[PDB]
Write a protein that binds this ligand. Structure first.
Ligand SMILES: NC(=O)C1=CN([C@@H]2O[C@H](COP(=O)(O)OP(=O)(O)OC[C@H]3O[C@@H](n4cnc5c(N)ncnc54)[C@H](OP(=O)(O)O)[C@@H]3O)[C@@H](O)[C@H]2O)C=CC1
Ligand SMILES: NC(=O)C1=CN([C@@H]2O[C@H](COP(=O)(O)OP(=O)(O)OC[C@H]3O[C@@H](n4cnc5c(N)ncnc54)[C@H](OP(=O)(O)O)[C@@H]3O)[C@@H](O)[C@H]2O)C=CC1
Lengths: 520, 518
């Protein structure tokens, strides 16, 4: 009933001054009169902290048992984007699909192909020979198109490819290959966040058009030995794994795993100097701001395109100043490198919180390259800009506000899932460079903001329970204290979530969440 | 529970209470606050534990269903004193109504197990004797050459042994009348007869073979009470501990007795408190507790008096908690001396802890042993009961044992003596005088559960209670103004299998723990 009070009395017996005085934020010599107040606060907070512990999840990778060899010869269409890919790689893949039955039919995509044009190429290849599946390589094409700077050209291509299979009425599994979009074990250092976008989108493609969608596979850095053979068997798995990574140690499948925090944490995180929240005048940024003020940030810099013009801006400066912090509210687009650069240097910021972003529910079929740009630009490109600046092990915190939409997905959330899966890989890439980064993909928050709409209705109806802001904050604190990289923090009603989520499409994604097992 | 208090005290936000519960000031560092918390919490915890040491005896309505029997012969054993021929005649007729035929043995006074064996030998060849029904426990008057010991109980014993020397292996059923209190307004209460239950419960364990059970008849034999008597003797469902009342047949059950707040009053002495056997182990603790809660004075008595180990040492502690102390050489069984003591010290609160403890199989037991074990405990209580005729007296407390409630191997005499105490207290209550009987499991420390004897009870499932918490329980019982309560820490999973080792029992069916050990 009360594990907090449990642990307290278990510390009281045991006589752990160290644990208790840490817990209460007090010195061994503190008077009872300071001790009592600190107790009631710890008590309210510990009970919410224990609640929030059960909201944590991480992404693991589990070994998938080899089960080949098998089958007779099929034709696959191999789709190759205009950039990002070495001929030597196409040949090695082609040659390894051949040595396992799969005959290859190569389609080369022109730059900025439309869904109309691709459906034509698909219609032609479909009639020619008997195509069983499509192996798309287009996600390796990271460069933006110059017309549309904020979208990687291969992700524009994936999109138009999912739509083109529709326009063509083509009912044929699409498989999406990436190299470095996931971290599947310690030792992965090829991390390519623009390619993670394929995974964020792909999970949604899988829900919206299960019939069009084979799966996602991540190739390793080193393609020596047998990895390319394992590719061939991965494409045929018949275990219905649809999120795979191929490594030195074989084929690995993506799982979501409860990640309860094993105590204690190795620090109590506090901002030193200035803290920056981009999108700091939104619902979530306002909370993050109140928290920083409460825990003694000397200055909070809040940015947004509207800046001081933003509804609530003057309320919020008042509240923050009433808690003793200095406040700077600036109008600044995240995507503007010079303005952000001047900004960081002027205030000497020591902690960055990236909350700039837009939410919109929009089916993949209704999404185009501009919509994708509209949704991604501040989140993704604001994250690169921040990453480029901040070339610095000194920073206390480089915290990205991501979403469950980017970790497991949901209908309507192609572009948003893409933008969010980028951040999780960006955070991993940064760590691999020796920099700090933290990416937290939230379930919805109570209060205003992105989960407040009829949108909040949709998400409640899918079995995501909004988290009280104060408990969300407590969980952020915890992540920061724990010095974590990626962790997902959501209050999910598994009874209701799973049946909705797995209506159209089976998934092994949640096999390791007990409450999710129960729910069919 | 405590905790729930603490957390709201903490919640918002009160130094005063928290500061008071822990002996320390608003200024105290956290490194003193910790230890103080652990000690508060540990005390509060032990309070809960000592709450779960409580049991009482209830009596459950059990209509016997087994009619079904046929016809046979019982021996019916009748003492010299305490029986109306009218009674013997009602019982003979009821036993004959239900198929049982009746052979009457009148037993000479002071009959030895030897003499008894003979007549039993004679009865057993002359007739196919199926059971034996003793009425001897009715004979309450003391043994001819043995003031300290009721005739009927010396007979019962000698009877148990007698079956021994004639290896008859036929069951003995013992009838009492008013030995037990089976519901409110049972007012015929006969402590000498209760001794039969204490010994009997032990006889059942030491000689299952030889033991039928115990049945208590009511005041008035009208309506069906004589009918039901026949039923109870041939119910056999075990059930060997039985009362018969206007409202049916009742079986004896041991039942957890959690304190059911509030606690009516907060008890303290108003004058001199006397503890008989006050220089024994338990005497010393209780005395420390009294002296602790503000007794003007404390009289400790004992045959040894001042020449007992702990002599002045004990007194020093007491004087030094701020008490007056009179250690007197006094024999509780001595009426004259005891009268003088209570007048002399205007004593308004009594705690009877004089007793004697040994483990002794029934077969090694005789009148003299029965007298050594009982004299102080029983005649002591009697003497204290005779004096102390005032409702003014705040306490009247009897230090009894679980050996008298459920029994154990080797504690026949001891069980008899304690059983006497429980019933006595009920009798005083019935007469409008205060009285309290607590039947303790074993205490940690010196005294009766100290030596080999503590080890013995250890193996049997009795966990010795820290003196300090036994005191917690005592205090509660007085505050609660209760009459009879058992207080013991029983490790049931060990207790049940060794207790019910040779003989089944229904006595614990109402203890949740006890049932998960069969
Ligand atoms: N609310 C929730 O439950 C969840 C939110 N999140 C994430 O948390 C973040 C905050 O969401 P929430 O607070 O709910 O949303 P809000 O819509 O309230 O705030 C987001 C803010 O981002 C700012 N922004 C947009 N574009 C830019 C830009 N180009 N440069 C700088 N700032 C910009 C916007 O302000 P302006 O227009 O003035 O520039 C807006 O105020 C979002 O990134 C969202 O992805 C994640 C999971 C759940
Ligand atoms: N120890 C335990 O755990 C339990 C104890 N009890 C009861 O508590 C009581 C005492 O226990 P405890 O203190 O452990 O045992 P002790 O032997 O320590 O104390 C018994 C004391 O009674 C005194 N006594 C014996 N005979 C007489 C007499 N004729 N007149 C006056 N005093 C006498 C003895 O003093 P002296 O020898 O100097 O005459 C002796 O000090 C007993 O009734 C026992 O039945 C009950 C249940 C459990």
């Amino acid at each position: 009933s009360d594990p907090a009070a449990g642990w307290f009395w278990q510390a009281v017996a045991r006589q752990d001054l160290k644990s208790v005085s840490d817990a209460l934020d007090l010195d061994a010599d503190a008077p009872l009169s300071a001790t009592l107040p600190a107790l009631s606060v710890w008590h309210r907070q510990e009970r919410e902290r224990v609640l929030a512990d059960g909201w944590r999840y991480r992404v693991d990778w589990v070994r998938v048992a080899p089960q080949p060899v098998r089958r007779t010869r099929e034709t696959w269409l191999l789709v190759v984007p205009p950039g990002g890919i070495e001929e030597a790689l196409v040949e090695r893949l082609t040659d390894a699909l051949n040595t396992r039955g799969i005959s290859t039919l190569r389609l080369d995509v022109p730059p900025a192909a439309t869904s109309g044009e691709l459906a034509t190429e698909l219609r032609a290849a479909a009639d020619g020979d008997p195509v069983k599946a499509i192996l798309s390589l287009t996600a390796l094409d990271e460069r933006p198109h110059p017309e549309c700077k904020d979208v990687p050209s291969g992700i524009a291509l994936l999109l138009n490819l999912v739509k083109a299979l529709g326009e063509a009425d083509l009912r044929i599994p699409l498989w999406t290959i990436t190299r470095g979009a996931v971290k599947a074990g310690p030792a992965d250092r090829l991390l390519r966040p623009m390619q993670a976008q394929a995974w964020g989108l792909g999970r949604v493609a899988a829900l919206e058009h299960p019939e069009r969608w084979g799966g996602l596979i991540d190739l390793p850095d080193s393609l020596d030995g047998d990895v390319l053979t394992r590719l061939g068997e991965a494409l045929t798995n018949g275990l219905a794994e649809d999120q795979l990574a191929i490594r030195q140690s074989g084929v690995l499948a993506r799982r979501l795993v409860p990640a309860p925090a094993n105590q204690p944490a190795g620090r109590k995180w506090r901002p030193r100097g200035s803290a920056l929240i981009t999108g700091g005048l939104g619902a979530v940024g306002a909370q993050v701001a109140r928290w920083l003020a409460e825990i003694g940030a000397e200055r909070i810099v809040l940015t947004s395109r509207r800046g001081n013009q933003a509804a609530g801006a003057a309320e919020l400066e008042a509240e923050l100043r009433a808690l003793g912090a200095q406040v700077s509210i600036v109008a600044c687009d995240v995507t503007d490198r010079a303005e952000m650069s001047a900004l960081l240097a002027e205030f000497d910021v020591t902690a960055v919180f990236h909350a700039a972003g837009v939410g919109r529910l929009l089916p993949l079929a209704e999404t185009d390259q501009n919509g994708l740009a509209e949704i991604c630009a501040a989140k993704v490109r604001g994250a690169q800009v921040l990453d480029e600046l901040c070339d610095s092990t000194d920073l206390d915190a480089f915290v990205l506000f991501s979403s469950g939409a980017g970790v497991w997905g949901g209908g309507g959330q192609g572009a948003y899932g893409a933008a969010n899966a980028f951040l999780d890989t960006l955070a991993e890439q940064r760590r691999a460079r020796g920099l700090p980064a933290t990416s937290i993909s939230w379930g919805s928050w109570a209060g205003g903001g992105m989960a407040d709409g009829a949108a909040g209705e949709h998400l409640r109806r899918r079995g995501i329970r909004p988290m009280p802001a104060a408990s969300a904050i407590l969980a952020l604190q915890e992540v920061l204290d724990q010095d974590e990289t990626c962790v997902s923090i959501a209050d999910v009603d598994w009874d209701r979530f799973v049946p909705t989520f797995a209506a159209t499409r089976a998934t092994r994604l949640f096999d390791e969440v007990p409450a999710a097992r129960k729910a069919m």
